[PDB]
């Protein structure tokens, strides 16, 4: 009948793939901790690799993104500075 719900009327879209899943365990410990530091994820002391991946993955599944802008940022930075170091402290906490 339609026009009564916002659900999908195809049951299953055209996709023979189970949707590729991202392995976050491959990432370096430093990378996962960096995610937690840059996104500010307060955690308990004594974190391990598996712990990081779970926390990172849980938050990684909920990242707001925009095609045009995200592509622009990617294209821009990579064609300019491929991972710039620039060692500088922002917040003078101590």
């Amino acid at each position: 009948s339609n026009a009564g719900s916002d659900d999908d009327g195809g049951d299953s879209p055209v996709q023979d793939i189970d949707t590729p899943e991202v392995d976050l365990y491959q990432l370096q410990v430093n990378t996962l901790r960096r995610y937690k530091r840059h996104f500010k994820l307060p955690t308990r002391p004594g974190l391990n690799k598996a712990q990081l991946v779970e926390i990172v993955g849980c938050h990684f599944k909920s990242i707001p993104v925009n095609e045009k802008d995200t592509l622009t940022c990617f294209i821009y930075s990579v064609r300019n500075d491929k991972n710039k170091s620039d060692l500088k402290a922002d917040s003078g906490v101590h």
Binding site: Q15, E67, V78
Partner: protein, 75 residues
């Protein structure tokens, strides 16, 4: 406007491939999420290429394009 016209060309080709290959909306979002965290100084270069391995790694031409764009030596 003035994006994928004269400036962006082969990049748009790449992204079209990625969009068409991943097929899943959330999977393509995943790719873009890898992009934003890379942009946000979170993940390293190789970390970026490696992360999308289960996605773009199936497609040699596509993943190689990605490597070539990132300047991925590994040599």
């Amino acid at each position: 406007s003035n994006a994928s016209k004269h400036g962006v060309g082969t990049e748009s080709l790449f992204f079209d491939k990625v969009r068409k290959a991943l097929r899943s909306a959330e999977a393509y979002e995943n790719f873009l999420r890898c992009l934003v965290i890379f942009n946000q100084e979170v993940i390293s270069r190789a970390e970026l290429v490696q992360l999308v391995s289960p996605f773009l790694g199936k497609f040699p031409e596509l993943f190689n394009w990605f490597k070539n764009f990132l300047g991925y030596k590994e040599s």
